[PDB]
Write a protein that binds this ligand. Structure first.
Ligand SMILES: [Zn+2]
Ligand SMILES: [Zn+2]
Lengths: 49, 49, 192, 68, 317, 145, 95, 45, 234, 49, 48, 196
């Protein structure tokens, strides 16, 4: 493996308009964010009330 | 329920959040608060004690 | 002013009372020279509010000073003791001075052998241009990563045991013993 | 931030050698050893332009005086 | 009480054994060989060459307007590192200003450069190519934009040799539409052991001439492996009608003394790795100020100077 | 930053990572004389728990002492003089006029001193004016084998 | 004050300890290596009290034949002569 | 008066003391102070 | 005090002149001693099951299911655990002391004087022989609070092992050395040992100091407290 | 010597080494690398069927 | 109390096992009384 | 698992007969053991980790109820047939993020690695990129950063190229100075003024 230089540069220079370049990070934080969604959606609060 | 979900790093740069924003904290008074994960016993399984 | 150097006994901001019509002041609690990188006029509310909140972001400079802590990525924390003169430092046959000198009295009783592994791997990957991969539980007891990097380095031309003959910076004449030199990743602490 | 001119270990200045080495990997198809064409005989001042992060081209896209 | 009757000083004899040869010289590189010299004197030579000769380097920076992203002190320091092409001997030292310090400038001490750039958004852009070299104009504050400002007679005294930054190509900072940096730099004579920016030589080191000598002649594969052990050139495979192959040291100077052969089990008995005790191989690399030969001559000159100064004060008492 | 010697590390047991200290100074003359004579660092060599001394040299000193002391060592006149002076530095201490040495252990084909001669020499340099030299036999740490 | 006599000097001015100001081994080691080339030197060793300052305590002990000032004088001179020989030779090498 | 920078719109606002604070062109309610030209001197260490 | 100071600066200067470093090869054993380690480990490849069958009472060629029932029956209790592990620990320790006695004095590359780590160890400077043993030979049994690795409900030491696994590899004994590296299954138990050593890691000084304030040595050499009453003579 | 011990049911679930030292040593442990938490249940009617 | 500083320590092998090397800052900020006799007069006067 | 490999790919994605989240806590019987009983759980908020089911070649998820009863091999090499029913994706999958981002972490005595995590969480690196709009109390940023020469691959995968925390130093282990004992260390003056 080599340091992704051209990747890193043509990453920085033009930020990606498609999606997050590092999905593993979003997955790493996935717990809380999905907790919030399942709160609002997923008929969670409506069950509580 | 934020205006940042689904956003690509590009428009995140259009706002003043870094390219790989994570989300996961409630912003109160400005300071990044967070609810810790805590361990409970198992759901609904009768445990011996 | 934006970017003006402050000191301790120095006003930062000035507000006056309306009724009394007298100016008050705010001094810099901190006790090190700090500048100001930007000041921010916080709209106090939804609107229709005079600027009742201001935000100053002071930038403090901390070069590596005597008494601060360094650590490789092995828990091998150290302390900046004297900042030796660059000429009194020894040198390789190529001559580049050792940017950081640590002691051999740290590795026994600390078992930080992966440090030596990382050192050799760095010495190789730097020369060839390789991003040395070091994922745990790849290298087996059949071939030690030691021997793999030893191949890398003997290909580089250096010693297989990472050693390198050094001349005393102060006496000039070489040491009786070869010396271990590599390229570790050092980050700085902030506890100081 | 920026490529640190006058490397720590070596005494060679390298700050000039950043975009000149970038457009070697970029369009010369040679791997990192294009720096050998640059003339970094050691490894010391060599390991800088190799694994230097040029984060500042991403920090600069944050002008609040962007007028837009 | 012992002098050994051979530790004597004989300027004639020392000089008659002393031999110099300049292997390679350039504008920036130099390597040469000295002989019949003790460790102390070569040590001292490296010692002066590294730090102990003065050289113009930016010291103060009067900032005028800097709205950039890089912090000011960082900008100042980074500039404080770019070299400066000017005769270091055509100057007179800066008397560091004690309290009562303001008026301590002249035109025989220091030099001033300046820069001021506001990256304007370039309107000739077709579409979005975040180069951004072509999207914006003057986005990169290089070293080629630190213009020397003459100070009186300087303009005339160096009219034959106009002073400039020796590398007009370094990128000093980076800018974007709206922001600006404006400042001027003050550069004086300073000695390396005061600040590294005053060390003129990029890299100065000397190697004791290593000697490689086999005791027993190796043969065939061991000869092949042996030549393969050390870098190429140092070992020749002996073209032997008697026997088939031996190895001999062609040029011990190309050799790196990494001591790889000694690692192999069987080779350990054949060869011994000594080093010449008296012969030195200097490798000199200045930065942009002076030519390495002038560096060498100036260094020894300064050592003579220090000898003379101690001598003069010794005469005093 | 306040600087002290290693040999005090052990007694203060401080790990020299940042652990700060209090630095006191007696005002009167009697208190300073008392600190100077009774509780001077030099008068704290045997801990009170048992007679075992705790102040003394550490990893680097014991290491290179082992190396140098080994009989395989040798020194020309240059090394011997430079090293003897380097250890002495009497001026920073005072109380001493001139340095005395020993003859070389070997003379032919060349003069050479051994590190063991060196230790003897330094021990001689501090020999009190009239205090008989030291005679002693005691086990070393490194086993003989 | 460039070079000063320290108060540990012998009455006979045979064991004086020169204290060179604003100097380090650059001159020290060369000086001593030259001095050890003098048969009339019984002792020659340099040190440094502390690197933070630039002071080098120097030492000369010699036979009662000649004192230390002349010894240091001639040693400096011989070293300068070495400098000149080196310079001359090297300069002659290149054109 | 004072001259500031509308954070988002990036527009000089020229607001005065004891005044409602907001961008005049877009309506933003956060504004930085511009950096005037102020003599500051640094060592190169 | 002077003598200490001068010896200090002395060895200091010697450090400037000579040089001393702990390079890599001072850990890599000789291939002869390397395969010595190999032979002895391959021998002890089955010691664990040996001590197991012995302590339980069955023989080494006993049926697998019989020993299975026995082991399940064993470490539902704890005393049975204590005795079993005690046996296993003595056994592994015998093996360990064995291969250590064989390798470290001569199996490694360069001999005592030139080996810079042998020096820093045997000279009392820093480290010990157990350190070179671990780094260069093996790690041994991982005594955590006495016995060893604890057994989970299914009695398997680890989801890497089968239940009622007997091999010392699953018994907290691991063979690898630091020099080459350790296997994940070993890494886990070793982490357990370390972090246990962590969680294992002054009011008396106002008790034993309270009544012991005075206790001074009066001139008559009859040591009292300051009130007048004796505590000791001489 | 309670839960503060690393009882060996964490292999791949929560990191062995990643844990502060001092008093809160052992108490707070971080998750392993890949271990997720399912947060969105599903219908299981076909499970009893 | 008064006349007692508080600082971080770093070791040093050059100085002494006895003496402690102190930065000049404290030498300035730590002072103590001294009667003046006739013979110590020149020292004290110089310090003044 | 089978319907999983179907629904993932082109196969029609019906309401899953048997979703992946559900954990099958089959508890074999034994004296003085856990009360044996099949235990199917579909509740959210459970610890669930993936491995590869060895019979098929597909993904598998289970929680800390089947672990204690499952023979999951650590290595494709370790598998003993007819008993070992699962294989770890990789031993990597046992460590956390920061502890995994550790050169040859399987070498040092574990307390060192533990200090390594606890202190490396306290490093003077970049805390992010968008600093201009951070209203925090105290942040810390280091000016001249570079990625290591030695690294685990996941340091590139996880996008750690965008938060360097240190540099790469020319280290030489040597007892030369005499000031670097009791763990102490020296810093080359030149490399320090040069922007260390
Ligand atoms: Zn370099
Ligand atoms: Zn606005």
């Amino acid at each position: 493996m080599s340091f992704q230089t051209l990747e890193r540069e043509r990453t920085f220079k033009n930020p990606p308009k498609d999606g997050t370049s590092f999905p593993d990070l979003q997955k790493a934080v996935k717990p809380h964010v999905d907790s919030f969604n399942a709160l609002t959606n997923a008929g969670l609060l409506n069950y509580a009330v | 329920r934020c205006h940042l979900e689904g956003l690509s790093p590009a428009e995140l740069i259009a706002h003043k959040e870094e390219s790989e924003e994570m989300g996961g904290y409630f912003i109160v008074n400005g300071i990044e608060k967070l609810i810790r994960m805590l361990i409970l016993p198992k759901r609904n399984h009768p445990t011996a004690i | 002013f934006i970017g003006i150097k402050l000191e301790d006994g120095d006003p930062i901001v000035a507000y006056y009372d309306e009724s009394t019509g007298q100016n008050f002041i705010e001094t810099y609690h901190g006790t090190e020279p700090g500048f100001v990188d930007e000041v921010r006029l916080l709209g106090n509310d939804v609107g229709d509010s005079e600027c009742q909140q201001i935000h100053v972001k002071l930038r403090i400079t901390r070069s590596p000073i005597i008494g601060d802590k360094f650590s490789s990525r092995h828990g091998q924390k150290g302390i900046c003791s004297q900042k030796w003169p660059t000429v009194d430092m020894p040198f390789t046959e190529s001559g580049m001075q050792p940017d950081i000198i640590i002691n051999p009295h740290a590795f026994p009783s600390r078992m930080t052998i992966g440090m030596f592994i990382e050192s050799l791997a760095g010495k190789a990957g730097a020369c060839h241009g390789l991003a040395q991969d070091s994922t745990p539980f790849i290298y087996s007891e059949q071939q030690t990563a030691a021997d793999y990097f030893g191949e890398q380095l003997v290909k580089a031309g250096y010693n297989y045991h990472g050693n390198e003959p050094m001349y005393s910076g102060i006496t000039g004449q070489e040491m009786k013993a070869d010396i271990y030199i590599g390229v570790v990743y050092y980050q700085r602490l902030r506890h100081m | 931030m920026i490529i640190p001119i006058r490397c720590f270990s070596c005494g060679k200045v390298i700050g000039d050698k950043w975009d000149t080495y970038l457009t070697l990997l970029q369009e010369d198809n040679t791997e990192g050893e294009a720096l050998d064409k640059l003339g970094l005989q050691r490894y010391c001042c060599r390991r800088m332009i190799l694994t230097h992060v040029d984060l500042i081209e991403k920090l600069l896209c944050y002008n609040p005086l962007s007028k837009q | 009480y012992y002098f050994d009757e051979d530790n004597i000083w004989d300027l004639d004899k020392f000089k008659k054994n002393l031999k110099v040869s300049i292997t390679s010289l350039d504008q920036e590189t130099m390597v040469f060989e000295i002989s019949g010299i003790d460790a102390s004197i070569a040590n001292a030579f490296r010692r002066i060459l590294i730090a102990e000769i003065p050289t113009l380097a930016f010291e103060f920076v009067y900032i005028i307007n800097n709205t950039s992203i890089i912090q000011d002190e960082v900008l100042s320091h980074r500039i404080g590192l770019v070299p400066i092409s000017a005769d270091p001997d055509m100057f007179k030292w800066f008397q560091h200003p004690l309290p009562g310090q303001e008026a301590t400038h002249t035109d025989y001490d220091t030099v001033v450069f300046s820069l001021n750039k506001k990256c304007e958004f370039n309107k000739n852009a077709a579409t979005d190519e975040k180069d951004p070299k072509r999207l914006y104009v003057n986005s990169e504050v290089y070293s080629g934009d630190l213009i020397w400002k003459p100070q009186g007679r300087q303009e005339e005294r160096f009219a034959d040799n106009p002073i400039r930054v020796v590398n007009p190509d370094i990128v000093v900072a980076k800018l974007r539409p709206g922001q600006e940096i404006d400042l001027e730099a003050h550069a004086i004579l300073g000695i390396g052991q005061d600040h590294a920016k005053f060390s003129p030589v990029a890299t100065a080191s000397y190697r004791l001439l290593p000697t490689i000598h086999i005791l027993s002649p190796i043969e065939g594969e061991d000869a092949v492996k042996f030549q393969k052990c050390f870098p190429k050139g140092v070992i020749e495979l002996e073209e032997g009608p008697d026997g088939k192959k031996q190895a001999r040291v062609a040029d011990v100077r190309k050799d790196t003394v990494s001591r790889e052969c000694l690692r192999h089990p069987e080779f350990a008995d054949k060869v011994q790795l000594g080093r010449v005790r008296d012969h030195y191989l200097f490798s000199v690399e200045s930065t942009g100020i002076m030519k390495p030969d002038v560096l060498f001559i100036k260094s020894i000159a300064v050592l003579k100077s220090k000898c003379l100064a101690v001598k003069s004060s010794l005469q005093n008492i | 930053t306040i600087r002290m010697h290693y040999a005090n590390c052990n007694s203060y047991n401080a790990d020299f990572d940042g652990d700060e200290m209090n630095m006191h100074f007696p005002q009167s003359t009697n208190a300073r004389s008392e600190a100077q004579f009774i509780a001077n660092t030099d008068s704290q060599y045997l801990v009170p728990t048992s007679g075992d001394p705790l102040r003394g040299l550490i990893q680097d000193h014991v290491v290179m002492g082992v190396w140098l002391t080994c009989k395989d060592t040798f020194y020309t006149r240059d090394e011997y003089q430079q090293l003897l002076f380097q250890a002495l530095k009497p001026d920073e201490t005072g109380m001493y006029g001139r340095i005395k040495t020993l003859p070389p252990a070997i003379q032919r084909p060349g003069i050479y001193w051994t590190g063991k001669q060196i230790i003897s020499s330094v021990l001689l340099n501090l020999k009190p004016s009239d205090r008989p030299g030291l005679n002693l036999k005691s086990k070393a740490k490194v086993p003989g084998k | 004050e460039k070079i000063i006599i320290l108060p540990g000097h012998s009455a006979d001015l045979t064991s004086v300890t020169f204290q060179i100001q604003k100097e380090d081994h650059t001159l020290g080691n060369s000086l001593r290596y030259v001095i050890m080339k003098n048969p009339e030197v019984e002792f020659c060793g340099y040190s440094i009290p502390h690197p933070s300052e630039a002071k080098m305590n120097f030492r000369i002990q010699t036979a009662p034949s000649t004192t230390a000032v002349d010894v240091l004088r001639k040693g400096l001179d011989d070293l300068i002569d070495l400098c000149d020989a080196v310079t001359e030779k090297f300069t002659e090498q290149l054109p | 008066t004072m001259i500031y920078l509308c954070a988002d719109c990036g527009a000089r606002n020229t607001i005065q003391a004891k005044e409602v604070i907001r961008c005049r062109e877009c309506g933003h309610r956060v504004m930085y102070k511009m950096r005037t030209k102020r003599m500051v001197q640094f060592e190169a260490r | 005090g002077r003598l200490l100071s001068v010896l200090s600066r002395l060895f200091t200067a010697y450090a400037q002149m000579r040089g001393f470093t702990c390079r890599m090869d001072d850990l890599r054993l000789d291939e002869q001693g390397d395969n010595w380690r190999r032979q002895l480990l391959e021998n002890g490849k089955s010691f664990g099951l040996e001590a197991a069958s012995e302590y339980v009472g069955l023989s080494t060629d006993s049926p697998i299911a019989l020993l299975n029932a026995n082991l399940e029956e064993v470490y539902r209790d704890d005393e049975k655990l204590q005795g079993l592990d005690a046996a296993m620990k003595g056994k592994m320790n015998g093996l360990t002391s064995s291969i250590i006695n064989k390798c470290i004095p001569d199996g490694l590359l360069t001999k005592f004087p030139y080996n810079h780590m042998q020096t820093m160890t045997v000279s009392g400077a820093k480290g010990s022989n157990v350190n070179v043993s671990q780094i260069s030979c093996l790690l041994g049994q991982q005594e955590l609070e006495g016995r060893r690795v604890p057994l989970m409900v299914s009695g398997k030491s680890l989801p890497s092992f089968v239940p009622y696994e007997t091999s010392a590899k699953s018994g907290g004994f691991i063979a690898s050395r630091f020099l080459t590296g350790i296997a994940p299954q070993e890494y886990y138990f070793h982490c357990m040992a370390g972090r246990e050593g962590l969680i294992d890691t002054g009011y008396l000084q106002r008790c034993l100091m309270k009544h012991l304030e005075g206790l001074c040595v009066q001139y008559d050499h009859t040591v009292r407290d300051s009130d007048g009453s004796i505590v000791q003579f001489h | 010597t309670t839960v503060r011990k690393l009882l060996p049911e964490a292999w791949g679930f929560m990191c062995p080494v990643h844990t502060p030292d001092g008093s809160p040593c052992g108490l707070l442990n971080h998750l392993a690398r890949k271990c997720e938490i399912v947060t969105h249940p599903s219908d299981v009617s076909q499970i009893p069927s | 109390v008064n006349y007692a500083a508080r600082s971080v320590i770093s070791p040093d092998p050059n100085i002494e096992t006895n003496e402690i090397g102190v930065p000049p800052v404290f030498a300035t900020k730590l002072t103590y009384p001294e009667p003046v006799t006739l013979y110590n007069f020149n020292e004290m006067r110089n310090a003044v | 698992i089978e319907y999983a490999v179907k629904l993932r790919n082109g196969t029609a994605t019906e309401p899953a007969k048997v979703p992946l989240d559900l954990e099958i806590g089959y508890v074999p019987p034994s004296h003085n053991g856990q009360y044996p009983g099949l235990y199917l759980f579909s509740n959210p908020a459970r610890m669930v980790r993936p491995v590869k089911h060895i019979s098929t070649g597909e993904l598998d998820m289970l929680g800390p109820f089947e672990q204690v009863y499952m023979d999951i091999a650590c290595f494709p090499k370790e598998i003993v047939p007819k008993v070992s029913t699962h294989v770890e994706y990789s031993p990597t999958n046992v460590l956390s993020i920061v502890a995994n981002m550790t050169p040859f972490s399987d070498f040092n005595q574990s307390p060192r690695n533990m200090y390594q995590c606890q202190m490396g969480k306290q490093t003077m690196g970049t805390p992010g990129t968008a600093l201009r709009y951070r209203t925090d109390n105290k942040l810390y940023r280091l000016q001249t950063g570079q990625t290591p020469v030695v690294r685990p691959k996941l340091h590139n995968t996880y996008g750690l190229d965008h938060y360097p925390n240190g540099t790469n130093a020319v280290v030489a282990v040597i007892s030369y100075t005499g000031y670097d004992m009791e763990d102490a260390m020296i810093l080359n003056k030149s490399a320090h003024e040069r922007g260390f």
